[PDB]
């Protein structure tokens, strides 16, 4: 009966809660009182990329951490040479309302998708010299919130239909579908080795998925609102989240629970994007307030601010070598920081 | 060789400029409304295009989405007007459509955006009224009907219309304005054209400090 099943669910939930609480002896801050603080960090705008006609929704760095792709709701994908600020490619998308883009780690393909529910893969390196769509991944039943290449043939997606999916790009079929969420899924992050990934959802819970087994290994629920942003720690054992409730939170995959919280009373706005710096000491965050903030991931002291945007900071990204940070914004410009 | 890449980038810039001109002068309309509403008449998003008097409209019939809107609706702060279509003759759903209109209008993000509200299917509404405020409403003579209309039809349809305008006026002081219409109808392009001209005019009045 439904009552008995739900009671068993609640007792299991309390077992999980008690295990996590028994593991929760110390705190990250309680240890890092002795850590030398980062102090102030100032980063200056080293570049500004001024091509996009409208609000920029996503950006992603190529693995050769110089090329960069960004998407804006005007229906354009642009690949930027982050050094010379040249536009390497400008791609007219079929659906104007693209909400995410990603760069293949081989650099051969970019993916983008949005309100059309289709993740389109574009071949950058055709012999004809133009950029053509390689494939369209149609199987989702909701807006695509995030995609991330695993490699030139496998891409994970997140959708408003509550499912994350793994795809075989050669065929275009879903290989395995990840379902356990209840609200619209908002962001992805592939583990460094790409065996696991974490997704954030409007149900304020974060989940850890097995790319191969296809099953939810863990669920995290600390936030009080929809999670807009999620990012893996560089070692792959912890991840940060960003929520409309103005807080970022660090969770540990081996402690199975929240490790740290990043908030300041002055911050009322929702977080739009998070990313770690290469060593993992700095946790950046994008906001509906136009400023992005830098958090000492261990101390939680707000080490700095990236002030140079005049609308919603919609996307953020650190280079693979950490030499720069990009941020896109609803003012339609991408600022590269260092 | 860098010079050749820069010439490529500047060719791309010229093409982007040629796009930006068409981006500015087109008007973007978000077309919302329940399943009952016959909004078709005038995979996800359908980005229909049309024009009036050399003004080109982009109408995004968002659809095939989970019933929640809170997230994907933030995309459309850039639109000139939401077009909200409601099938007036489905008396029972009409309260649900009313709450839907409330959720749109008082949406944190849409606060700037006017709503062109089509009270659709006037013909079925009339034929039903010939064959919902059953007790204590009568038409204010400030608005008068077209010839041939049974005053029962008029009083009913102006009751429904008032119900939406009531929500439109109880909040959103004057930042955005609901433009109700009755329709079935070849003129719906023209109604949109006129109400978009009016929305743009009011936006200018605000912007030019007039």
């Amino acid at each position: 009966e439904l009552d008995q099943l739900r009671q068993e669910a609640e007792q299991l939930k309390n077992q999980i809660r008690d295990a996590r609480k028994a593991c929760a002896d110390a705190t990250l801050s309680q240890i890092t009182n002795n850590i030398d603080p980062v102090g102030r960090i100032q980063m200056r705008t080293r570049r500004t990329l001024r091509g996009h006609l409208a609000k920029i929704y996503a950006m992603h760095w190529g693995t050769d951490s110089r090329l960069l792709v960004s998407a804006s709701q005007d229906g354009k994908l642009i690949i930027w040479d982050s050094y010379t600020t040249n536009k390497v490619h400008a791609i007219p998308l079929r659906s104007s309302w693209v909400m995410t883009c990603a760069y293949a780690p081989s650099g051969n393909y970019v993916a983008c998708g949005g309100l059309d529910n289709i993740c389109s893969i574009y071949n950058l390196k055709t012999r004809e010299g133009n950029v053509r769509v390689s494939r369209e991944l149609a199987g989702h039943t909701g807006y695509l919130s995030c995609c991330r290449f695993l490699d030139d043939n496998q891409i994970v997606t997140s959708s408003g239909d509550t499912t994350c999916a793994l795809w075989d790009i050669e065929t275009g079929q879903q290989t395995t579908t990840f379902t356990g969420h209840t609200g619209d899924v908002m962001s992805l992050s592939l583990a460094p080795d790409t065996r696991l990934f974490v997704s954030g959802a409007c149900d304020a819970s974060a989940k850890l998925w097995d790319v191969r087994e296809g099953m939810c290994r863990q669920t995290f629920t600390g936030h009080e609102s929809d999670i807009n942003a999620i990012c893996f720690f560089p070692n792959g054992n912890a991840f940060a989240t960003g929520s409309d409730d103005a807080t970022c939170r660090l969770f540990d995959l081996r402690a199975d629970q929240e490790l740290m919280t990043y908030s300041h009373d002055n911050i009322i706005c929702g977080i739009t994007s998070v990313s770690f710096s290469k060593s993992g000491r700095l946790l950046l965050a994008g906001y509906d307030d136009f400023n992005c903030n830098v958090w000492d991931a261990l101390k939680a002291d707000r080490a700095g601010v990236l002030a140079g945007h005049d609308n919603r900071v919609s996307c953020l990204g650190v280079t693979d070598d950490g030499m720069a940070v990009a941020t896109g914004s609803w003012d339609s410009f991408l600022k590269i920081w260092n | 060789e860098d010079k050749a890449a820069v010439e490529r980038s500047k060719m791309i810039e010229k093409q982007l400029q040629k796009d930006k001109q068409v981006y500015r002068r087109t008007l973007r309309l978000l077309l919302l409304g329940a399943d009952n509403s016959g909004k078709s008449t005038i995979s996800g998003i359908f980005e229909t295009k049309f024009q009036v008097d050399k003004v080109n409209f982009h109408m995004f019939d968002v659809g095939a989405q989970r019933d929640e809107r809170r997230k994907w609706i933030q995309c459309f702060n850039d639109v000139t007007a939401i077009i909200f279509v409601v099938d007036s003759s489905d008396y029972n759903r009409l309260q649900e459509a009313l709450n839907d209109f409330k959720s749109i209008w008082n949406n944190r993000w849409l606060r700037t955006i006017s709503v062109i509200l089509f009270l659709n299917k006037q013909d079925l509404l009339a034929e039903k009224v010939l064959a919902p405020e059953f007790a204590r409403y009568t038409t204010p003579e400030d608005a008068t009907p077209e010839p041939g209309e049974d005053p029962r039809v008029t009083r009913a349809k102006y009751f429904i219309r008032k119900e939406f305008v009531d929500i439109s006026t109880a909040s959103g002081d004057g930042r955005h304005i609901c433009y109700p219409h009755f329709t079935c109808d070849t003129e719906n392009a023209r109604r949109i054209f006129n109400d978009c001209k009016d929305i743009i005019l009011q936006m200018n009045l605000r912007e030019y400090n007039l």
């Epitope: 650099g107 012999r127 004809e128 133009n130 | 060789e1 010439e7 490529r8 060719m11």
Partner: single-chain antibody, 232 residues
Framework: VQLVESGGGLVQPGGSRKLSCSAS????????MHWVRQAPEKGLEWVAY????????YYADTVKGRFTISRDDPKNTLFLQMTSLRSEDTAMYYC??????????????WGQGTTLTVSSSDIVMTQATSSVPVTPGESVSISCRSS???????????LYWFLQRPGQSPQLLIY???NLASGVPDRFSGSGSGTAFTLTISRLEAEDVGVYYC?????????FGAGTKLEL
């Protein structure tokens, strides 16, 4: 992808002739085109250039003023109007596409070429030997030297390697030092010190027989090294 050069034939000296090259199977408008020349049994020699969108045009000073390079993007065609042809101008003229952006492969594709018969302080590329006979399965290291450092301040070396098989147009082997072209087997390798460079064919096969040409792209009244032809 297919470039078909047309025009030429035989000209009385002092006449005029116009080459026409028709491109197909690629986005003609986005590629910068070059005309390259090869006098009979001689080396390759640059002739002209016209960037994408006709915004930039260059010429070899040998033909400056005499030759006009033009393109017709809507018709995917490349032209070369020749005004007063001298005996020197007798040669096969190859159309070449090149596209320049971060990571592109310029000169990657060459037309089949058309034959025309007629009745200082730049970079100079020197190739050590006319020929090298070697048996299949051996390794080879063709070498080149430049009068100027092709290592640019931006950190990449603008040396190119082309292989012209007997009776074929050249095909790009390495578009910048060590940047192996597309469609060529990993056997070919390249490196250099910024003034001297060597094309290492790691494990030779009978398919490699032909003439190897180096080419610079650092600063271009574009110029080629003389041919080195492998034998077996």
């Amino acid at each position: 992808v297919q470039l078909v050069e047309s025009g030429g034939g035989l000209v009385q000296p002092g006449g005029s002739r116009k080459l026409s090259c028709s491109a197909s199977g690629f986005a003609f408008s986005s590629f910068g085109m070059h005309w390259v020349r090869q006098a009979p049994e001689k080396g390759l020699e640059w002739v002209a250039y016209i960037s994408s969108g006709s915004g930039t045009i260059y010429y070899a000073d040998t033909v400056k003023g005499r030759f006009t390079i033009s393109r017709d993007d809507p018709k995917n065609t490349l032209f070369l109007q020749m005004t007063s042809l001298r005996s020197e101008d007798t040669a096969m003229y190859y159309c070449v596409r090149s596209i320049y952006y971060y990571g592109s492969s310029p000169f990657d594709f060459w037309g089949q070429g058309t034959t025309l018969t007629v009745s200082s302080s730049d970079i100079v590329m020197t190739q050590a030997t006319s020929s090298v006979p070697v048996t299949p399965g051996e390794s080879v290291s063709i070498s080149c030297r430049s009068s100027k450092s092709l290592l640019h301040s931006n950190g990449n070396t603008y040396l190119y390697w082309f292989l012209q098989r007997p009776g074929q147009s050249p095909q790009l082997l390495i578009y910048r030092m060590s940047n192996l072209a597309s469609g060529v087997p990993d056997r070919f390798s390249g490196s250099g010190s910024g003034t001297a460079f060597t094309l290492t064919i790691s494990r030779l096969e009978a398919e490699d027989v032909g003439v190897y040409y180096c080419m610079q792209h650092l600063e271009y009244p574009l110029t080629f090294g003389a041919g080195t032809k492998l034998e077996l």
